Amino acid sequence: MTTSKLVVTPLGSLAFQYAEGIKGFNSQKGLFDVAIEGDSTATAFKLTSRLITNTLTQLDTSGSTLNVGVDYNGTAVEKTGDTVMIDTANGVLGGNLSPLANGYNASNRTTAQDGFTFSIISGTTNGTTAVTDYSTLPEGIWSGDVSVQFDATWTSSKLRAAVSKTTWADAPARE
């Protein structure tokens, strides 16, 4: 059977509610689990994340959207690049995912947990026109999948790569 080299699992769901007092949406942390399989021949390890989808679309006919920002320690996780999480060759050990930095070349499996902070960073009235005032948006529900790709490579004096897509499915925002 095909054994899993990298599996990143979201631990719960994402949901956003509008708060009148701050004229915008609240924010949320979301934990995930990371499991990797050990490669004894490996001399370097690297883990990155990249944003895949982050659009919530109004359920009405407006075409209104909201975009979800994904933050890893004050660093955006984005569609246009890979956010470095672990990079052993350059001493980046990966904080609460440290145990992977220590176990990527062990002869077993290694797990660790971390999280992202999720918030609403912008939106559109109709799909195009940018929102300047969230309080003027239509009522009801915006919904969409928030998904983050996690890359993992195993260098050696030789390359093995694995990917895992983590999906916060049908994340709603409500006003």
Side-chain angles (χ1 to χ4, degrees), residues 2-3 6-22 24-106 108-138 140-156 159 161-175:
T2 302
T3 65
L6 169 74
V7 184
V8 190
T9 305
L11 292 187
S13 275
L14 304 180
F16 302 94
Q17 295 85 0
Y18 179 81
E20 191 173 345
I22 63 144
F25 294 93
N26 57 37
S27 77
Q28 186 173 355
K29 289 145 207 298
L31 304 182
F32 49 88
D33 179 63
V34 187
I36 65 175
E37 157 154 324
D39 180 4
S40 72
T41 73
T43 58
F45 187 67
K46 183 178 179 180
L47 189 63
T48 59
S49 51
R50 177 192 284 246
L51 195 57
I52 303 300
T53 51
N54 76 327
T55 309
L56 321 175
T57 301
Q58 244 294 346
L59 267 41
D60 72 11
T61 55
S62 69
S64 170
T65 65
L66 301 168
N67 306 118
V68 181
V70 179
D71 179 285
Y72 188 64
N73 309 320
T75 296
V77 180
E78 292 172 302
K79 295 186 172 179
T80 51
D82 300 292
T83 293
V84 172
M85 304 179 81
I86 294 175
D87 183 8
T88 62
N90 291 301
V92 182
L93 298 189
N96 291 331
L97 300 179
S98 63
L100 315 176
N102 288 139
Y104 74 94
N105 53 23
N108 50 16
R109 302 181 65 81
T110 312
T111 59
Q113 297 81 48
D114 218 332
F116 296 136
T117 304
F118 297 86
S119 70
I120 302 312
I121 54 161
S122 59
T124 60
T125 54
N126 56 4
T128 299
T129 304
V131 167
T132 60
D133 187 353
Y134 288 108
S135 72
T136 56
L137 280 156
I141 305 192
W142 290 256
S143 184
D145 290 351
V146 181
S147 64
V148 171
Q149 178 176 298
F150 285 83
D151 290 343
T153 320
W154 281 275
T155 43
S156 184
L159 188 144
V163 187
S164 178
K165 185 183 64 189
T166 303
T167 303
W168 289 268
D170 303 305
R174 305 187 70 155
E175 170 164 15

PDB file of all heavy atoms in Angstrom, residues 129-146, unseen atoms left out:
ATOM      1  N   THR A 129     -15.499  45.473  -8.004  1.00  0.00           N
ATOM      2  CA  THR A 129     -15.410  46.699  -7.248  1.00  0.00           C
ATOM      3  C   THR A 129     -15.025  46.471  -5.763  1.00  0.00           C
ATOM      4  O   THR A 129     -15.726  45.869  -5.015  1.00  0.00           O
ATOM      5  CB  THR A 129     -16.733  47.492  -7.301  1.00  0.00           C
ATOM      6  OG1 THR A 129     -17.117  47.742  -8.643  1.00  0.00           O
ATOM      7  CG2 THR A 129     -16.587  48.768  -6.632  1.00  0.00           C
ATOM      8  N   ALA A 130     -13.905  47.018  -5.359  1.00  0.00           N
ATOM      9  CA  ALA A 130     -13.428  46.838  -4.022  1.00  0.00           C
ATOM     10  C   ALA A 130     -14.276  47.492  -2.946  1.00  0.00           C
ATOM     11  O   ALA A 130     -14.840  48.541  -3.146  1.00  0.00           O
ATOM     12  CB  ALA A 130     -12.050  47.259  -3.921  1.00  0.00           C
ATOM     13  N   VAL A 131     -14.392  46.803  -1.817  1.00  0.00           N
ATOM     14  CA  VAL A 131     -15.154  47.303  -0.675  1.00  0.00           C
ATOM     15  C   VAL A 131     -14.293  48.256   0.149  1.00  0.00           C
ATOM     16  O   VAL A 131     -13.129  47.964   0.422  1.00  0.00           O
ATOM     17  CB  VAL A 131     -15.650  46.130   0.214  1.00  0.00           C
ATOM     18  CG1 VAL A 131     -16.154  46.624   1.568  1.00  0.00           C
ATOM     19  CG2 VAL A 131     -16.735  45.339  -0.500  1.00  0.00           C
ATOM     20  N   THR A 132     -14.865  49.399   0.530  1.00  0.00           N
ATOM     21  CA  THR A 132     -14.174  50.362   1.393  1.00  0.00           C
ATOM     22  C   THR A 132     -14.855  50.425   2.752  1.00  0.00           C
ATOM     23  O   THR A 132     -14.298  50.976   3.709  1.00  0.00           O
ATOM     24  CB  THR A 132     -14.162  51.795   0.800  1.00  0.00           C
ATOM     25  OG1 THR A 132     -15.508  52.253   0.616  1.00  0.00           O
ATOM     26  CG2 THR A 132     -13.418  51.842  -0.522  1.00  0.00           C
ATOM     27  N   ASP A 133     -16.064  49.867   2.820  1.00  0.00           N
ATOM     28  CA  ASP A 133     -16.897  49.933   4.011  1.00  0.00           C
ATOM     29  C   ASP A 133     -17.728  48.656   4.135  1.00  0.00           C
ATOM     30  O   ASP A 133     -18.743  48.500   3.458  1.00  0.00           O
ATOM     31  CB  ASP A 133     -17.806  51.168   3.932  1.00  0.00           C
ATOM     32  CG  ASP A 133     -18.589  51.423   5.216  1.00  0.00           C
ATOM     33  OD1 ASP A 133     -18.557  50.582   6.147  1.00  0.00           O
ATOM     34  OD2 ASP A 133     -19.253  52.483   5.282  1.00  0.00           O
ATOM     35  N   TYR A 134     -17.301  47.756   5.018  1.00  0.00           N
ATOM     36  CA  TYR A 134     -17.967  46.462   5.182  1.00  0.00           C
ATOM     37  C   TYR A 134     -19.407  46.579   5.665  1.00  0.00           C
ATOM     38  O   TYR A 134     -20.222  45.664   5.474  1.00  0.00           O
ATOM     39  CB  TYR A 134     -17.187  45.576   6.148  1.00  0.00           C
ATOM     40  CG  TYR A 134     -15.897  45.029   5.597  1.00  0.00           C
ATOM     41  CD1 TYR A 134     -14.665  45.503   6.052  1.00  0.00           C
ATOM     42  CD2 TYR A 134     -15.902  44.010   4.642  1.00  0.00           C
ATOM     43  CE1 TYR A 134     -13.473  44.992   5.555  1.00  0.00           C
ATOM     44  CE2 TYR A 134     -14.721  43.493   4.140  1.00  0.00           C
ATOM     45  CZ  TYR A 134     -13.512  43.981   4.601  1.00  0.00           C
ATOM     46  OH  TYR A 134     -12.342  43.457   4.109  1.00  0.00           O
ATOM     47  N   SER A 135     -19.719  47.707   6.292  1.00  0.00           N
ATOM     48  CA  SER A 135     -21.039  47.905   6.867  1.00  0.00           C
ATOM     49  C   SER A 135     -22.095  48.151   5.800  1.00  0.00           C
ATOM     50  O   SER A 135     -23.278  48.046   6.079  1.00  0.00           O
ATOM     51  CB  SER A 135     -21.032  49.037   7.894  1.00  0.00           C
ATOM     52  OG  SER A 135     -20.907  50.293   7.267  1.00  0.00           O
ATOM     53  N   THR A 136     -21.659  48.468   4.586  1.00  0.00           N
ATOM     54  CA  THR A 136     -22.578  48.724   3.478  1.00  0.00           C
ATOM     55  C   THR A 136     -22.823  47.484   2.620  1.00  0.00           C
ATOM     56  O   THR A 136     -23.508  47.556   1.597  1.00  0.00           O
ATOM     57  CB  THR A 136     -22.090  49.884   2.577  1.00  0.00           C
ATOM     58  OG1 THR A 136     -20.771  49.600   2.097  1.00  0.00           O
ATOM     59  CG2 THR A 136     -22.087  51.207   3.343  1.00  0.00           C
ATOM     60  N   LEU A 137     -22.261  46.351   3.034  1.00  0.00           N
ATOM     61  CA  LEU A 137     -22.425  45.102   2.292  1.00  0.00           C
ATOM     62  C   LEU A 137     -23.832  44.528   2.485  1.00  0.00           C
ATOM     63  O   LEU A 137     -24.487  44.837   3.480  1.00  0.00           O
ATOM     64  CB  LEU A 137     -21.337  44.088   2.677  1.00  0.00           C
ATOM     65  CG  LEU A 137     -19.975  44.301   1.996  1.00  0.00           C
ATOM     66  CD1 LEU A 137     -18.860  43.687   2.818  1.00  0.00           C
ATOM     67  CD2 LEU A 137     -19.955  43.741   0.577  1.00  0.00           C
ATOM     68  N   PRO A 138     -24.319  43.730   1.515  1.00  0.00           N
ATOM     69  CA  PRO A 138     -25.616  43.064   1.698  1.00  0.00           C
ATOM     70  C   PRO A 138     -25.564  42.049   2.838  1.00  0.00           C
ATOM     71  O   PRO A 138     -24.488  41.529   3.158  1.00  0.00           O
ATOM     72  CB  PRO A 138     -25.833  42.337   0.365  1.00  0.00           C
ATOM     73  CG  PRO A 138     -24.453  42.178  -0.209  1.00  0.00           C
ATOM     74  CD  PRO A 138     -23.728  43.427   0.201  1.00  0.00           C
ATOM     75  N   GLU A 139     -26.719  41.779   3.437  1.00  0.00           N
ATOM     76  CA  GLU A 139     -26.830  40.770   4.485  1.00  0.00           C
ATOM     77  C   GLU A 139     -26.772  39.350   3.901  1.00  0.00           C
ATOM     78  O   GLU A 139     -26.766  39.160   2.679  1.00  0.00           O
ATOM     79  CB  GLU A 139     -28.111  40.975   5.304  1.00  0.00           C
ATOM     80  CG  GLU A 139     -28.075  42.190   6.228  1.00  0.00           C
ATOM     81  N   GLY A 140     -26.715  38.359   4.784  1.00  0.00           N
ATOM     82  CA  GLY A 140     -26.684  36.974   4.360  1.00  0.00           C
ATOM     83  C   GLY A 140     -25.308  36.352   4.490  1.00  0.00           C
ATOM     84  O   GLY A 140     -24.533  36.700   5.385  1.00  0.00           O
ATOM     85  N   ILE A 141     -25.009  35.421   3.591  1.00  0.00           N
ATOM     86  CA  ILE A 141     -23.882  34.513   3.756  1.00  0.00           C
ATOM     87  C   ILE A 141     -22.926  34.558   2.570  1.00  0.00           C
ATOM     88  O   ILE A 141     -23.358  34.510   1.431  1.00  0.00           O
ATOM     89  CB  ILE A 141     -24.375  33.049   3.916  1.00  0.00           C
ATOM     90  CG1 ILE A 141     -25.369  32.926   5.073  1.00  0.00           C
ATOM     91  CG2 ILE A 141     -23.195  32.083   4.101  1.00  0.00           C
ATOM     92  CD1 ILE A 141     -25.674  31.482   5.481  1.00  0.00           C
ATOM     93  N   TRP A 142     -21.632  34.635   2.865  1.00  0.00           N
ATOM     94  CA  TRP A 142     -20.578  34.348   1.900  1.00  0.00           C
ATOM     95  C   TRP A 142     -20.000  32.971   2.254  1.00  0.00           C
ATOM     96  O   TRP A 142     -19.822  32.678   3.437  1.00  0.00           O
ATOM     97  CB  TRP A 142     -19.459  35.375   2.028  1.00  0.00           C
ATOM     98  CG  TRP A 142     -19.772  36.765   1.568  1.00  0.00           C
ATOM     99  CD1 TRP A 142     -19.362  37.350   0.405  1.00  0.00           C
ATOM    100  CD2 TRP A 142     -20.510  37.770   2.283  1.00  0.00           C
ATOM    101  NE1 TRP A 142     -19.797  38.644   0.347  1.00  0.00           N
ATOM    102  CE2 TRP A 142     -20.502  38.933   1.486  1.00  0.00           C
ATOM    103  CE3 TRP A 142     -21.167  37.801   3.522  1.00  0.00           C
ATOM    104  CZ2 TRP A 142     -21.149  40.118   1.872  1.00  0.00           C
ATOM    105  CZ3 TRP A 142     -21.810  38.985   3.914  1.00  0.00           C
ATOM    106  CH2 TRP A 142     -21.792  40.124   3.092  1.00  0.00           C
ATOM    107  N   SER A 143     -19.713  32.128   1.255  1.00  0.00           N
ATOM    108  CA  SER A 143     -19.129  30.807   1.505  1.00  0.00           C
ATOM    109  C   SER A 143     -18.076  30.419   0.462  1.00  0.00           C
ATOM    110  O   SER A 143     -18.214  30.772  -0.716  1.00  0.00           O
ATOM    111  CB  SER A 143     -20.242  29.754   1.571  1.00  0.00           C
ATOM    112  OG  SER A 143     -19.742  28.476   1.888  1.00  0.00           O
ATOM    113  N   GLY A 144     -17.046  29.691   0.905  1.00  0.00           N
ATOM    114  CA  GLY A 144     -15.992  29.170   0.035  1.00  0.00           C
ATOM    115  C   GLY A 144     -14.978  28.299   0.760  1.00  0.00           C
ATOM    116  O   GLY A 144     -14.861  28.348   1.976  1.00  0.00           O
ATOM    117  N   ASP A 145     -14.252  27.476   0.006  1.00  0.00           N
ATOM    118  CA  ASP A 145     -13.156  26.666   0.544  1.00  0.00           C
ATOM    119  C   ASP A 145     -11.908  27.516   0.750  1.00  0.00           C
ATOM    120  O   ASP A 145     -11.495  28.188  -0.177  1.00  0.00           O
ATOM    121  CB  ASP A 145     -12.749  25.583  -0.470  1.00  0.00           C
ATOM    122  CG  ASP A 145     -13.776  24.491  -0.644  1.00  0.00           C
ATOM    123  OD1 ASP A 145     -14.780  24.407   0.113  1.00  0.00           O
ATOM    124  OD2 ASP A 145     -13.544  23.671  -1.564  1.00  0.00           O
ATOM    125  N   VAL A 146     -11.292  27.444   1.935  1.00  0.00           N
ATOM    126  CA  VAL A 146      -9.969  28.039   2.184  1.00  0.00           C
ATOM    127  C   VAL A 146      -8.961  26.896   2.184  1.00  0.00           C
ATOM    128  O   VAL A 146      -9.008  26.019   3.048  1.00  0.00           O
ATOM    129  CB  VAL A 146      -9.888  28.771   3.561  1.00  0.00           C
ATOM    130  CG1 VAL A 146      -8.516  29.388   3.759  1.00  0.00           C
ATOM    131  CG2 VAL A 146     -10.957  29.861   3.658  1.00  0.00           C
TER     132      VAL A 146
END
